Design an enzyme around this catalytic site. Structure first.
Site, PDB file in Angstrom:
ATOM      1  N   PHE A 131       1.316   5.147   1.247  1.00 44.84           N
ATOM      2  CA  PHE A 131       1.874   6.524   1.207  1.00 44.84           C
ATOM      3  C   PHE A 131       0.798   7.570   1.097  1.00 44.84           C
ATOM      4  CE2 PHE A 131       4.904   3.684  -0.746  1.00 44.84           C
ATOM      5  CZ  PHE A 131       6.137   4.051  -0.191  1.00 44.84           C
ATOM      6  N   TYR A 139       9.103  -3.329  -2.830  1.00 49.55           N
ATOM      7  CA  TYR A 139      10.406  -3.959  -2.621  1.00 49.55           C
ATOM      8  C   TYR A 139      10.391  -5.484  -2.729  1.00 49.55           C
ATOM      9  CZ  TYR A 139      11.828   0.748  -1.263  1.00 49.55           C
ATOM     10  OH  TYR A 139      12.035   2.108  -1.240  1.00 49.55           O
ATOM     11  N   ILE A 149      10.213   3.191  -6.431  1.00 55.62           N
ATOM     12  CA  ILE A 149       9.451   1.948  -6.571  1.00 55.62           C
ATOM     13  C   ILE A 149       8.430   2.095  -7.707  1.00 55.62           C
ATOM     14  CG2 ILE A 149       9.783   1.093  -4.187  1.00 55.62           C
ATOM     15  CD1 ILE A 149       6.907   2.214  -3.605  1.00 55.62           C
ATOM     16  N   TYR A 173       5.992  13.246   1.023  1.00 57.72           N
ATOM     17  CA  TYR A 173       5.334  11.959   1.289  1.00 57.72           C
ATOM     18  C   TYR A 173       5.481  11.584   2.761  1.00 57.72           C
ATOM     19  CZ  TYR A 173       9.903   9.707   1.620  1.00 57.72           C
ATOM     20  OH  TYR A 173      11.186   9.335   2.018  1.00 57.72           O
ATOM     21  N   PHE A 196       7.502   4.579   8.450  1.00 54.06           N
ATOM     22  CA  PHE A 196       8.927   4.302   8.174  1.00 54.06           C
ATOM     23  C   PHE A 196       9.724   5.507   7.647  1.00 54.06           C
ATOM     24  CE2 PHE A 196       6.753   2.728   4.388  1.00 54.06           C
ATOM     25  CZ  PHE A 196       7.504   3.363   3.375  1.00 54.06           C
ATOM     26  N   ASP A 197       9.018   6.498   7.108  1.00 62.35           N
ATOM     27  CA  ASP A 197       9.694   7.685   6.607  1.00 62.35           C
ATOM     28  C   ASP A 197       8.691   8.786   6.296  1.00 62.35           C
ATOM     29  OD1 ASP A 197      11.904   9.168   4.791  1.00 62.35           O
ATOM     30  OD2 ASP A 197      12.815   7.524   5.934  1.00 62.35           O
TER      31      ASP A 197
END
Length: 127
Positions: free
Chosen positions: A118, A101, A75, A45, A55-56
Site C-alpha cells: 500500500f 487476509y 487488516i 490509499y 486491487f483498489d
C-alpha cells in the site's frame, strides 16, 4: 518497483520483528503527533498485490477510507502501520498474509497467502 524496494529497504515495525509489516516513509508528515488508539483516522490509499497488480484505490472515487485505529476494523498491518504515521505523511507498507487476509484471502481480489503493498496518506485523525 515500489514493492521490491520495501522488501529490500523497509523498516520492520512489528513488535515481533517477523518482517510482517515493512515500512518506508515517502513524504514526511507534520510535527510529532501520531494517532491514539480509538482515534478516527482518515486515509487515502493505493493498494497492490506484491506482484504489482492494483486491487483498489480510495482516489478512484475520491473517498477517503475512515476507521477507528486499533479496533480491528482493518487488516492488522494498517492498525500497526497507520499508528506510526504523522498527519500528512505518505508511506509504503508491505504486509505479509498473517497481517492481512491470511490463508483465506479475500476473493476475488486477494488470493490465499497474499503479501500486499500500500501507498498510504494519513490525511487526518480525530479524537
Amino acid at each position: 518497483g515500489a514493492p521490491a524496494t520495501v522488501t529490500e529497504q523497509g523498516e520492520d515495525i512489528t513488535s515481533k520483528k517477523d518482517r510482517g509489516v515493512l515500512k518506508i516513509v515517502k513524504r514526511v508528515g507534520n510535527g510529532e503527533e501520531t494517532p491514539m488508539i480509538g482515534d478516527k483516522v482518515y486515509v487515502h490509499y493505493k493498494g497492490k498485490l506484491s506482484n504489482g497488480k492494483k486491487f483498489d484505490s480510495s482516489h478512484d472515487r475520491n473517498e477517503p477510507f475512515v476507521f477507528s485505529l486499533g479496533k480491528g476494523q482493518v487488516i492488522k498491518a494498517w492498525d500497526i502501520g497507520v499508528a506510526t504515521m504523522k498527519k500528512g505523511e505518505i508511506c509504503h507498507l508491505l504486509c505479509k498474509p498473517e497481517y492481512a487476509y491470511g490463508s483465506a484471502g479475500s476473493l476475488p481480489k486477494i488470493p490465499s497467502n497474499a503479501t500486499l503493498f500500500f501507498e498510504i496518506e494519513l490525511l487526518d485523525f480525530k479524537g
